[PDB]
C-alpha cells in the first residue's frame, strides 16, 4: 500500500559549525584540533643526548659539567634550564648563532691543532673549574709566565684547516680583576691579542677592572669564535691574557635540538616536540604549543574545531 | 502510520544511513539501502583521508626559552609567528566550516537521489504523499516490496491494475 524513504537519526547529536549556521546538529563529528599532550620526550630510533647540567656551548670549551659530551653524537639534543656553558665566569659573544649551529650539528668531532709552547706555563687553573682540585677548560689552555710578574714572550701560532668541512675555532680573552694580577700572570706593559684569518681580523685587549663577584671571582673570560674554511689559516698573536684553543671542532652530520623540562622516554616514538613533551597525532592542527618543533601539526588559536562525519540530525517526532 | 525523510529522520533505522519503510496487509517493515549508504560514506571517507595527511616539513628553534634572544630580532620573530598563527587559525576555521556545509549538502543529495530512483521504478503505479512516501495503487506484498528495494520491480506487470485504482 505504502513505501517510504528515510535516513537514520539520533536523539542527541553533536553540534558543529557551518558557513550559514552556528551549532547545527549532526549525527556524528570528530575533532580536528589536538589538545592531548604526552609529558615525555619520545626518542625511539633517535640518537639522544640529555645534556643536563652541561650547556650546549660548554661542549666546545669543556667545563667539568660537560666532560662526557666533548665528542658526542646525536640525532636529538636536549637542553635543560640548569645547563651552564661556563665554569670560570664569562659568556660567548654571538652565543645564540652558535647554539643554532650546534643544535643541527649531529654532534662534534675534535682534532688537535698542534700548538707547542716553550718557556711558558700552560697549566693555569682555577677553583671555579674544580676537578678534584683546580683545573681548567678541557679544550683550552691558560697561558702564563714562568714566574710571577715575569714578562710573557711575544707569540705567534698558526693553524691550517686541512679537512673538507669548516672548522669551529674558539679562543678566550682574560679580563683580570686588577692590573696587579694581570702583571702577576703575564708581566707588566700593554697586553695585545690579535686574531687573523683570510676573512677575519680583530684585536682584543684585557680590561682590568672591578666586577660584581660571581663564584667569588670578579674576573671574566670572553669566548670568541670563527668558522675556518677548508685550506684557510688562523693566526694568533699575543703577549699575554690569551686563552688558547687546544682542539678544533667539526660538525658530524644532521640533528635537531630542543629545550625541555620533562624526562626522556625511549619507549615511545615521536617527531613533534615542545618544552612540555611530545605531540603524537594524526590531526592537522594543535592547540598545545605555538613553538613546537620537528614535524608538527599547525598551531591554531581555537581549542576545538569539530568536523562533521555524518548527516544533519533530524530527530524523530510522533 | 509511517512518514518519510521530508518530515523527519528515523532513530530506529540500523545497519545503514538510508532505507525503506513499507506498509501493507502483512504488516510494517524497515530495511536499509546499501548503495546510498556506501556512497555517502565514500565521500566522507575521502574528506577524512585528506584531513590526516601530514607535512614532511621540519621546523627548528629560532628563539630561546631559557635565555631570551636580543629584543629587536625577538620582536620580529614573535610578530612573524603570530601572523602565521592568525593565518592558520583562519584556514582551520574556514576549512571545517566549508567541509561541514558540504558534508550536510552531499548527505541530503544522496537522499534525493534515492527518492528519485524509487519514483522512477514505480512509474505510474504510485503517487507521492508529500512526506517522502509513495502511495502504491496496487496490492504490494512483502515480495513486491523487496523487489522495489533490490531494483527488480516491473511496473508493466502491475500497471493496468494500478491505473484502474488511480482513476476511481
Amino acid at each position: 500500500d505504502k513505501i517510504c524513504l528515510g535516513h537514520h537519526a539520533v536523539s542527541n547529536g553533536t553540534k558543529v559549525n557551518t558557513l550559514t549556521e552556528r551549532g547545527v546538529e549532526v549525527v556524528n563529528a570528530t575533532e580536528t584540533v589536538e589538545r592531548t599532550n604526552i609529558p615525555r620526550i619520545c626518542s625511539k630510533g633517535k640518537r639522544t643526548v640529555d645534556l643536563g647540567q652541561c650547556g650546549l656551548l660548554g661542549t666546545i670549551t669543556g667545563p667539568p659539567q660537560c666532560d662526557q659530551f666533548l665528542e658526542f653524537s646525536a640525532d636529538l639534543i636536549i637542553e635543560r634550564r640548569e645547563g651552564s656553558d661556563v665554569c670560570y665566569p664569562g659568556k660567548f659573544v654571538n652565543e645564540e648563532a652558535l647554539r643554532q649551529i650546534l643544535r643541527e650539528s649531529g654532534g662534534i668531532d675534535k682534532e688537535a691543532m698542534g700548538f707547542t709552547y716553550s718557556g711558558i706555563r700552560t697549566n693555569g687553573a682555577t677553583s671555579a673549574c674544580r676537578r678534584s682540585g683546580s683545573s681548567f677548560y678541557a679544550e683550552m689552555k691558560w697561558l702564563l709566565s714562568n714566574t710571577d710578574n715575569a714578562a710573557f714572550p711575544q707569540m705567534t701560532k698558526s693553524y691550517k684547516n686541512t679537512r673538507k668541512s669548516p672548522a669551529l675555532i674558539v679562543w678566550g680573552i682574560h679580563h683580570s680583576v686588577s692590573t696587579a694580577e694581570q702583571t702577576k700572570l703575564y708581566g707588566s706593559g700593554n697586553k695585545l691579542v690579535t686574531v687573523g684569518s683570510s676573512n677575519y681580523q680583530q684585536s682584543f685587549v684585557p680590561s682590568p677592572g672591578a666586577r660584581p663577584q660571581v663564584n667569588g671571582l670578579s674576573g671574566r673570560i670572553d669566548f670568541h669564535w670563527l668558522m675556518l674554511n677548508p685550506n684557510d689559516t688562523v693566526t694568533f698573536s699575543f703577549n699575554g691574557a690569551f686563552i688558547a684553543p687546544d682542539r678544533a671542532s667539526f660538525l658530524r652530520g644532521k640533528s635537531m635540538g630542543i629545550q625541555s623540562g620533562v624526562q626522556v622516554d625511549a619507549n615511545c616514538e615521536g617527531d613533534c616536540y615542545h618544552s612540555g613533551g611530545t605531540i603524537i597525532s594524526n590531526l592537522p592542527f594543535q592547540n598545545i604549543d605555538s613553538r613546537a618543533v620537528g614535524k608538527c601539526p599547525r598551531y591554531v588559536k581555537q581549542r576545538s574545531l569539530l568536523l562533521a562525519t555524518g548527516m544533519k540530525n533530524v530527530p524523530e517526532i510522533p | 502510520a509511517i512518514a518519510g525523510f521530508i518530515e523527519n529522520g528515523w532513530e530506529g533505522l540500523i545497519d545503514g544511513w538510508y532505507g525503506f519503510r513499507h506498509q501493507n496487509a502483512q504488516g510494517e517493515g524497515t530495511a536499509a539501502d546499501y548503495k546510498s549508504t556506501q556512497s555517502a560514506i565514500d565521500q566522507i571517507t575521502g574528506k577524512l583521508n585528506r584531513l590526516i595527511e601530514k607535512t614532511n616539513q621540519q621546523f627548528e628553534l629560532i628563539d630561546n626559552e631559557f635565555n631570551e634572544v636580543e629584543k629587536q630580532i625577538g620582536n620580529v620573530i614573535n610578530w612573524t609567528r603570530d601572523s602565521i598563527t592568525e593565518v592558520w587559525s583562519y584556514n582551520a576555521e574556514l576549512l571545517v566550516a566549508m567541509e561541514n556545509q558540504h558534508t550536510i549538502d552531499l548527505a541530503d543529495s544522496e537522499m534525493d537521489k534515492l527518492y528519485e530512483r524509487v519514483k522512477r521504478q514505480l512509474r505510474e503505479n504510485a503517487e507521492e504523499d508529500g512526506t517522502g512516501c509513495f502511495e502504491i495503487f496496487h496490492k504490494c506484498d512483502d515480495d513486491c516490496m523487496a523487489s522495489i528495494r533490490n531494483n527488480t520491480y516491473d511496473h508493466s506487470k502491475y500497471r493496468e491494475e494500478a491505473m484502474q485504482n488511480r482513476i476511481q
Partner: nanobody, 122 residues
Framework: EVQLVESGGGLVQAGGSLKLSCAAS?????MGWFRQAPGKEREFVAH????????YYSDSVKGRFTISRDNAKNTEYLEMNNLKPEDTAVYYC???????????????????WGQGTQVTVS
C-alpha cells in the same frame, strides 16, 4: 567476534607476482591490508569498501597491487605484481564490523586483524 585468516604468502623473485587471500568468518564491511617490516610500525597498503565499489592504495604500492573481494565467499584478495625488495614484510588483512566513515590508512580504525603471512622478495 569476526576472525580473519590469511593465506598465500611466500618467497618470490624480484619483479614476480603473488596473490594473498583473506578468509573471514563473520560479518565484514570495509576491509583492508596492512604490512609490517621487522622493527617497524604497521603500514597501510590497500583498502576496499564494504560493497567493493571503491578502492584505496598507498603511494608506494599504487599501480602494482590490486585489492578485491567476494561477498558471497566472504573473502578478500590482494594481488601483488612487480614485487620489490622493500615489499618484504608480514602482511595482515583487516576488517571493520559496521558501517563506518573513517580514514583508511589508520590502523586503529580496524578492529579485526589476521595473524599475518610472511612475504619475502629476493
Amino acid at each position: 567476534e569476526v576472525q580473519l585468516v590469511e593465506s598465500g604468502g611466500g618467497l618470490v623473485q624480484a619483479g614476480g607476482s603473488l596473490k594473498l587471500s583473506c578468509a573471514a568468518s563473520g560479518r565484514t564491511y570495509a576491509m583492508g591490508w596492512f604490512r609490517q617490516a621487522p622493527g617497524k610500525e604497521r603500514e597501510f597498503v590497500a583498502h576496499i569498501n564494504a560493497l567493493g565499489t571503491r578502492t584505496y592504495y598507498s603511494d608506494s604500492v599504487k599501480g602494482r597491487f590490486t585489492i578485491s573481494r567476494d561477498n558471497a565467499k566472504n573473502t578478500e584478495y590482494l594481488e601483488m605484481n612487480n614485487l620489490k625488495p622493500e615489499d618484504t614484510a608480514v602482511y595482515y588483512c583487516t576488517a571493520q564490523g559496521q558501517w563506518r566513515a573513517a580514514p583508511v590508512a589508520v590502523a586503529a580504525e580496524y578492529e579485526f586483524w589476521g595473524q599475518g603471512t610472511q612475504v619475502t622478495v629476493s
